[PDB]
Design a protein around this ligand. Structure first.
Ligand SMILES: Nc1ncnc2c1nc(NCc1ccccc1Cl)n2[C@@H]1O[C@H](CO)[C@@H](O)[C@H]1O
Ligand SMILES: [Mg+2]
Length: 382
């Protein structure tokens, strides 16, 4: 009894779930009305577990018991140099247990608990499963889950294991760039094509070179930047206004965690607005020492603050082409994935790199990966 199989994009910062119903893909909104769910887990001092939006929106109220970025640790050993580097930037405790990086949190009443990365990802998957069950009005037991194309055996197995813990039979593990290509129907075409998938997420940047031959895919090469994403663009804008505030008032706003988070939230809203407007107002009531903040950010200033970061996305694209023994003219399809690809400067740089070639468009870049996973889930549902 596979019932309705769900397609899940289990992302580093955000996750997305789809189902194939009545001849089309349906991306499912969670209990907060959002078509994407933060891959966040929070342990409150009352012994309650919060997942997704509720966990992310409570992060500032004590940051050591809010867990995120588990995807950076999943299927990795504790002594992996990538884990040893990542834990330096993570606010919650990571300890060595059974050779792996276990996440250590306070669960209330002086109780400390330890969770494997796949246990944290299983909580995110349980939330995705509940979002789908609330929509379908039936139990969900099977899934197609996506992973980055660079994921090794242990990472793919720990992702399946996260599914098992969540009460999901992970029938297929599919590569994220392949799922995005499927969303665009590139698997349902006769002939041979070279696809460049440009995936700029919340915290990661992945570039993948795929070949498609009569519905058959091959990942030829992968590259990117494991620590480059939308969150880094927000940070550059934050640093800018923190320095401007210190110059205008003489006050260092970084002492107050609430002030910094208020700026962070408003900066992320202004950034998103700048993808369709040339100016956005950043307004914060009682920002610091009861004083209001009111500043404008132009798209031109947003672009210059992030110019090095945006242009740096070009280097991995040149690297994949070299590793694939291909030239720019050999690319038949350019697929943009990740919410950060909405940035006009990002779309402009990709277009300029490919000498005016327009990328594939029309599928929401935050949902493209879950969309493709849901197409495959539809074939498995019967
Ligand atoms: N229009 C956008 N311009 C620039 N960057 C964007 C945009 N949309 C998103 N995301 C999706 C989204 C849409 C509406 C409301 C909330 C959200 Cl999160 N991003 C960025 O994509 C990353 C992963 O969502 C984040 O860094 C996010 O800040
Ligand atoms: Mg993604």
């Amino acid at each position: 009894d596979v019932g309705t199989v769900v397609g899940i994009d289990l992302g580093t910062t955000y996750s997305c779930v789809g189902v194939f119903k009545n001849g089309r893909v349906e991306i499912i909104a969670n209990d907060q009305g959002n078509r994407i769910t933060p891959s966040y887990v929070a342990f409150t001092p009352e012994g309650e577990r919060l997942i997704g939006d509720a966990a992310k929106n409570q992060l500032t109220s004590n940051p050591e018991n809010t867990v995120f970025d588990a995807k950076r640790l999943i299927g990795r050993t504790w002594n992996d140099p990538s884990v040893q580097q990542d834990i330096k930037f993570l606010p919650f405790k990571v300890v060595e247990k059974k050779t792996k990086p276990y996440i250590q949190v306070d669960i209330g009443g002086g109780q400390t608990k330890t969770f494997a990365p796949e246990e944290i990802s299983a909580m995110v998957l349980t939330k995705m499963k509940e979002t789908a069950e609330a929509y379908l009005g039936k139990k969900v037991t099977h899934a197609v889950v996506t992973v980055p194309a660079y994921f090794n055996d242990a990472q793919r197995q720990a992702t399946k294991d996260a599914g098992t813990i969540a009460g999901l039979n992970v029938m297929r593990i599919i590569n994220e760039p392949t799922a995005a290509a499927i969303a665009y129907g590139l698997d349902k075409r006769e002939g041979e094509k070279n696809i460049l998938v440009f995936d700029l997420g919340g915290g990661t940047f992945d570039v993948s070179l795929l070949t498609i031959d009569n519905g058959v895919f091959e990942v030829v090469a992968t590259n990117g930047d494991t620590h480059l994403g939308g969150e880094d663009f927000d940070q550059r804008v934050m640093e800018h206004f923190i320095k401007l505030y210190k110059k205008k008032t003489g006050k260092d706003v970084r002492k107050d965690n609430r002030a910094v988070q208020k700026l962070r939230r408003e900066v992320e809203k202004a950034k998103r607005a700048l993808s369709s407007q040339h100016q956005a107002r950043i307004e914060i009531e009682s920002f610091y020492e009861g004083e209001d903040f009111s500043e404008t950010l132009t798209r031109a200033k947003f672009e210059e603050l992030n110019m090095d970061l945006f242009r740096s996305t070009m280097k991995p694209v040149q690297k994949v082409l070299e590793d694939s023994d291909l030239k720019k003219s050999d690319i038949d399809e350019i697929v943009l994935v990740g919410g950060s690809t909405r940035i006009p400067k990002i779309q402009q740089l990709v277009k300029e790199f490919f000498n005016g070639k327009e990328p594939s468009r029309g599928i929401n870049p935050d949902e493209a990966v879950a969309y493709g996973a849901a197409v495959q889930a539809g074939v498995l549902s019967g």
